[PDB]
Amino acid sequence: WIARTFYDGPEKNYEKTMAILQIEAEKAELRLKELEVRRLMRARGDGPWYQYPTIDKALIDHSPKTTPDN
Amino acid sequence: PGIVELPTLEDLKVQEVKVSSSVLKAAAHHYGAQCDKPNKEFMLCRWEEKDPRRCLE
Numbered sequence: 001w002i003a004r005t006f007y008d009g010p011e012k013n014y015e016k017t018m019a020i021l022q023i024e025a026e027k028a029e030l031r032l033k034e035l036e037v038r039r040l041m042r043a044r045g046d047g048p049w050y051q052y053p054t055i056d057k058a059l060i061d062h063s064p065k066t067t068p069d070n
Numbered sequence: 071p072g073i074v075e076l077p078t079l080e081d082l083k084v085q086e087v088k089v090s091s092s093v094l095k096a097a098a099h100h101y102g103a104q105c106d107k108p109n110k111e112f113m114l115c116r117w118e119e120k121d122p123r124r125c126l127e
């Protein structure tokens with residue numbers, strides 16, 4: 001009666017633990033991958049992150065400058 | 071990083087205009103009206119090549 005009224009079968013806890021383990025293992029893998037990706041982008045600078053600004057090329061004046069040799 | 075190429079002193083010989091600035095200013099307007107085509111050719115070459123060594127002729 002106690003088991004019927006208050007508790008649940010072993011399979012429920014078993015499968016819930018499987019799901020929790022899957023979720024947290026995926027999270028750990030994603031954390032390692034994030035660290036590696038951050039290191040690579042900061043070292044190289046070829047990704048969307050760590051893009052430090054440079055001078056805009058639309059600021060340059062392309063017109064004769066009173067002197068042929070600029 | 072490379073050797074600069076300079077024309078020989080023979081390439082720079084020309085019979086120069088030996089008149090003073092007052093003479094040039096007195097005749098400047100007619101000179102500009104008459105000698106427009108060669109002068110404009112040289113100036114266009116000068117701003118387009120951006121190099122004295124490409125504009126001697």
Ligand SMILES: CCCCCCCCCCCCCCCCC[C@@H](O)O[C@H](CO[C@H](O)CCCCCCCCCCCCCCC)COP(=O)(O)OCC[N+](C)(C)C
Nearest residue numbers: 001002003004005006007008009010011012013014015016
């Ligand atoms: C002769 C009898 C011998 C045995 C006596 C046993 C008496 C039991 C009293 C102590 C029980 C402690 C509580 C244990 C469980 C409570 C918490 C939780 O586990 O139970 C909840 C349920 O709790 C109960 O609904 C309520 C328990 C409250 C007990 C109160 C008893 C004392 C009350 C005293 C009041 C006095 C009167 C007021 C005087 C002013 C959730 O259960 P639920 O998730 O649904 O279960 C679903 C199971 N399925 C999935 C298989 C269907």
